[PDB]
Amino acid sequence: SMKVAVLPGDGIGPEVTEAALKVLRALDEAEGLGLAYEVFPFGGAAIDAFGEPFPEPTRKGVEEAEAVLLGSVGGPKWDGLPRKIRPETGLLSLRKSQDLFANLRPAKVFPGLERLSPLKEEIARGVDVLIVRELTGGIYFGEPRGMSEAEAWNTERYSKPEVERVARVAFEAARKRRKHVVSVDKANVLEVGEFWRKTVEEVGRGYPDVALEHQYVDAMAMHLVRSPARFDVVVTGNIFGDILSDLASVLPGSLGLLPSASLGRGTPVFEPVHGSAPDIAGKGIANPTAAILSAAMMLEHAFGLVELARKVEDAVAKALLETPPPDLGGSAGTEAFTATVLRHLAAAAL
Amino acid sequence: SMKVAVLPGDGIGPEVTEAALKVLRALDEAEGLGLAYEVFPFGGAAIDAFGEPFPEPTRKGVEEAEAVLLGSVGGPKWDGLPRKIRPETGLLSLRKSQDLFANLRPAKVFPGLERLSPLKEEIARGVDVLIVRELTGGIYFGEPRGMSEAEAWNTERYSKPEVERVARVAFEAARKRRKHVVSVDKANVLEVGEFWRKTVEEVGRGYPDVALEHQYVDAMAMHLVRSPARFDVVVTGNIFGDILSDLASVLPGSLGLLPSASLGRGTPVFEPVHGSAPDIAGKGIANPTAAILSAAMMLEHAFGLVELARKVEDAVAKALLETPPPDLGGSAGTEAFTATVLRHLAAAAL
């Protein structure tokens, strides 16, 4: 069995999630996976129907599933709502309630696809980075937070156990990869960066088989574009991970490519890094690669189906060469691009 | 009368500041500018002699000067000091004591120098971006702040007047440029981002001749590398401006290139974006472009010598064509590169 709660959300979310469901249904028919999914209202779609972005039946669906496949939430229609019911607060709540503290956001340039990057070929060649972002703490969830007429405030707060457990994930990921971690902070200005750095250094002592370096967040952002092949695992807190991972999209060449997994105590969540892209929603052009590769991360991390996840990545890469979507300089919209993916997947099987 | 307080600082700070001084001296001799400068201890060097990074004689010099030419502060020698007296806190105290709230950090790709970027030529071509970063508020200065054994906290916060005065600077800069402002925040997750967005939008109603757009900081980091030519003025808070301005160095191709001005109520300060670069300090290689162009920004913003600022910018461009430094793939050390800038300046003098 493979029990999946599907949260398509808003804007391009449903468009890309549908493309990802087509790939999963195809795998399920080919492989006998026992795929069982149900679609649940989430974000702005949930607000329009229930008045809150993460309503009861959706919380229940998440809770009872083995994995969540998520699209994206948000858009101009919901601009101005009180924060406690905004579409993005629904995704914060989902993460927090499942204690999904480890956000894995990989960025790789597939051999032969260096041409898709805005970076010169020789700079993009061989890039394979993994961002391990702390997802349930920091300024996203810190108290106090608020606003008056005169001012507004938010609190970047981390405890020792929160830093420890995300650091452990990064070192364990680096063990499985190329044995390098760079930890990222603003320790020269912020108490919380200092605390972060010391704690990651403490956890590092238990992994003498892994190399540990530290970088200030400003320099890291530069180094990640100028010398990306240098980095293996990058560990950082909630807001800096959010920023470095959208930035990491310029390595393979588009934010339409980047998948993610959110792992922790509860039901794991797999979603594109990208948002709901209201500028192109409803035009049938959204690149579904990030949703499709998030379904591949789900197969690997939630279901242990490592080889199927790899066939999906391979058919995506082929489709990227054959029929690029518009965000990568081609003209294949969502359904045509997914169709190319499905033909490569059928060619690899049938 | 051109009274300048010079704060060389630590690591490559004195190296590149000396080169900027050679350029200012050649201008003073050729133009009779009444240049009168004095060199003051600052950062780590001030800590070792006086016990604090912004000591009394340097405070007095800054106060009595019409402008500050500042190098860089910091390095492993001062790691572990109480925060109150860290080299970087000396730079925070300089900014705050002079109420320099507007940090101007420009990034341009000069025509014919696109090949210096790690981005493909067609992407770097025509780039001309000005980041206007709020410099005296936000998480850098927010209270409460602290660290125990169990946790650490910092407060990101902004008042209405602090947002307003930096937004006004951004719109007034846009009016002199291409009349486009993008304001950058994280309003979908942070109260402070929403307060920022609302306030910039309110200020923008006075400037309806300026297009105003808003981007979340993660999507902005991505857009700045993929589509840099689309941006004119970018306004943002303290930490986001820190990050995006290091990232902006990949457009012309090196952090060794980017100058900045800090403007407000008190004595304006001009310094490179880059740090003290302890990994190359004392090797005679540091690119002095950023310091030299910071002296140009000083001539423009503090002294109204716009024509002389442009001549310096033109001699720097030609030096980068003829004898690039090692951070840009060439072999000219700091002194050799400066000598090329001086040769071009002396030709322009004719």
Ligand SMILES: NC(=O)c1ccc[n+]([C@@H]2O[C@H](COP(=O)([O-])OP(=O)(O)OC[C@H]3O[C@@H](n4cnc5c(N)ncnc54)[C@H](O)[C@@H]3O)[C@@H](O)[C@H]2O)c1
């Ligand atoms: N996980 C999420 O639900 C998530 C993440 C980020 C943003 N958001 C929400 O998304 C909305 C848009 O915000 P944004 O513009 O900053 O982020 P965005 O990630 O939605 O879009 C960023 C840029 O990339 C383009 N883009 C993104 N995904 C793409 C795809 N698959 N194909 C082609 N182009 C793509 C968009 O058109 C836009 O130009 C906002 O409401 C934001 O709050 C949601």
Ligand SMILES: NC(=O)c1ccc[n+]([C@@H]2O[C@H](COP(=O)([O-])OP(=O)(O)OC[C@H]3O[C@@H](n4cnc5c(N)ncnc54)[C@H](O)[C@@H]3O)[C@@H](O)[C@H]2O)c1
């Ligand atoms: N304005 C300031 O005084 C300032 C700004 C940033 C960092 N710092 C401090 O500087 C020190 C180093 O921090 P960092 O490594 O993150 O930042 P950095 O900006 O000093 O160096 C970042 C990278 O760019 C290279 N680089 C920087 N300037 C260069 C130049 N002019 N020419 C050639 N290469 C150059 C460096 O060697 C290094 O690889 C720390 O003590 C940090 O706190 C100070």
Ligand SMILES: CC(C)[C@H](C(=O)O)[C@@H](O)C(=O)O
């Ligand atoms: C929807 C929002 C909370 C989110 C985040 O900032 O985590 C978005 O950029 C993302 O990257 O998921």
Ligand SMILES: CC(C)[C@H](C(=O)O)[C@@H](O)C(=O)O
């Ligand atoms: C010295 C430090 C406070 C500084 C900053 O973050 O402002 C550094 O990155 C810089 O960019 O000046």
Ligand SMILES: [K+]
């Ligand atoms: K998403």
Ligand SMILES: [K+]
């Ligand atoms: K479950």
Ligand SMILES: [K+]
């Ligand atoms: K500096």
Ligand SMILES: [K+]
């Ligand atoms: K003064």
Ligand SMILES: [Mn+2]
């Ligand atoms: Mn994001």
Ligand SMILES: [Mn+2]
């Ligand atoms: Mn910086």
